């Protein structure tokens, strides 16, 4: 199983050719954190203009990418991350997302692997 960073997901809904080919090459379930969904959901209304087209693109992404809820198990993983690596205010959100990947034993796929190499036990895939 794979969990896409928010940034990787943003490139997928943007049909970015570089990411989209690497996604279709991946054999295995392709999962999405609900934290990322909340970020995506806000980006739909960032501008007045082409919302609804951003909304139309996000909806087809949700129909195909199953969403992991953020629950007690992931919040246990988050606490364990703060215990080993220390607390980092800037990395709270990304640590919530990785915590879910830990909880479900999934490789975490990201453009920013250096920000996660302090999370013990996280399988990483840098792009």
């Amino acid at each position: 199983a794979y969990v896409l960073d928010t940034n990787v997901a943003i490139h997928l809904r943007d049909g970015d050719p570089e990411v989209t080919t690497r996604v279709t090459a991946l054999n295995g379930a392709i999962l999405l954190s609900i934290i990322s969904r909340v970020e995506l959901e806000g980006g739909v209304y960032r501008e007045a203009a082409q919302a609804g087209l951003r909304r139309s693109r996000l909806d087809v992404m949700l129909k195909v990418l199953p969403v992991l809820d953020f629950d007690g198990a992931a919040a246990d993983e988050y606490r364990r991350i703060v215990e080993s690596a220390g607390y980092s205010r800037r990395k709270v959100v990304d640590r919530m997302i990785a915590a879910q990947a830990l909880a479900h034993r999934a490789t975490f796929v990201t453009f920013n692997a250096d920000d996660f190499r302090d999370i013990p036990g996280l399988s990483l895939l840098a792009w």
Binding site: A1, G15, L53, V60, V64
Partner: protein, 64 residues
């Protein structure tokens, strides 16, 4: 629908099966997709292919 459990594999008539406790169970008439990657089974209600997502996205307009 947010719980953990432990369990053992078991035999149900010539095929392996795993019980789903009530808090982790899906419906009775719910189609599931099951994907193993190593020893990590991922199960979820069936959704539709990755290509169809990529196909559908590129047939829609991108913004900017």
């Amino acid at each position: 629908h947010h719980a953990r459990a432990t369990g053992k594999t078991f035999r149900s008539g010539n095929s392996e099966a795993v019980r789903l406790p009530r808090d982790l169970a899906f419906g009775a008439d719910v189609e599931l997709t099951l994907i193993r990657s190593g020893d990590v089974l991922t199960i979820y209600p069936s959704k539709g292919s990755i290509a169809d997502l990529v196909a559908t996205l590129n047939q829609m307009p991108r913004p900017d």
